[PDB]
């Protein structure tokens, strides 16, 4: 089971220093900062991040979640990337949860995290080129150091 313990304000960022953004059709996307489109995306670039606190401990759960008129959750439900329309909650009787993510940091490189569905195991959150956009998508991971399913989590609290 999880409790929730604090939030953070979050700016993510994939292997190219893109930064995650949730653009007009709710598409989380990942912009090149000298994007045109940059100024309209800032409001949607704001992530919270929730830590839990985890009575089966397997890496840190988090659930991450945006704040546009309401707040929604990112989920991996079906194996694939949603957003859940709820606040992220206060508690979870299960040990799993298609909005709980497990962070953990790279080998050798602290700051580089990865994000695992607590429902599939080794299923990841990834970024990957689609034509000319990049997409977060669930991806079946074998390979932990495919530098696609690793990310920066940068702090904006302060």
Same mark, same amino acid.
């Given at each position: 089971?999880?409790?929730?313990?604090?939030?953070?304000?979050?700016?993510? *960022?994939?292997?190219? /220093?893109?930064? !995650? $953004?949730?653009?007009?059709?709710? *598409? &989380?996307?990942?912009?090149?900062?000298? /994007?045109?489109?940059?100024? /309209? +995306?800032? &409001?949607?670039?704001? $992530?919270?991040?929730?830590?839990?606190?985890?009575?089966?401990?397997?890496?840190?759960?988090?659930? @991450?979640?945006?704040?546009?008129?309401?707040? #929604?959750?990112?989920?991996?439900?079906?194996? @694939?990337?949603? %957003?859940?329309?709820? +606040?992220? &909650?206060? +508690?979870?009787?299960?040990?799993?949860?298609?909005? @709980?993510?497990?962070?953990?940091?790279? &080998?050798?490189?602290?700051?580089?995290?990865? %994000?695992?569905? #607590?429902?599939?195991?080794?299923?990841?959150?990834?970024?990957?080129?689609? *034509?000319?956009? $990049?997409?977060?998508?669930?991806?079946?991971?074998?390979? !932990?150091?495919? *530098?696609? @399913?690793?990310?920066?989590?940068?702090?904006?609290?302060?």
């Amino acid at each position: 089971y999880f409790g929730k313990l604090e939030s953070k304000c979050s700016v993510i *960022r994939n292997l190219n /220093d893109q930064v !995650l $953004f949730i653009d007009q059709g709710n *598409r &989380p996307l990942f912009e090149d900062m000298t /994007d045109s489109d940059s100024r /309209d +995306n800032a &409001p949607r670039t704001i $992530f919270i991040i929730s830590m839990y606190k985890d009575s089966q401990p397997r890496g840190m759960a988090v659930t @991450i979640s945006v704040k546009s008129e309401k707040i #929604s959750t990112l989920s991996s439900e079906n194996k @694939i990337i949603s %957003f859940k329309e709820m +606040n992220p &909650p206060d +508690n979870i009787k299960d040990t799993k949860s298609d909005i @709980i993510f497990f962070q953990r940091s790279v &080998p050798g490189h602290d700051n580089k995290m990865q %994000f695992e569905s #607590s429902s599939y195991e080794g299923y990841f959150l990834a970024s990957e080129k689609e *034509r000319d956009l $990049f997409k977060l998508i669930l991806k079946k991971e074998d390979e !932990l150091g495919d *530098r696609s @399913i690793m990310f920066t989590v940068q702090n904006c609290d302060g």
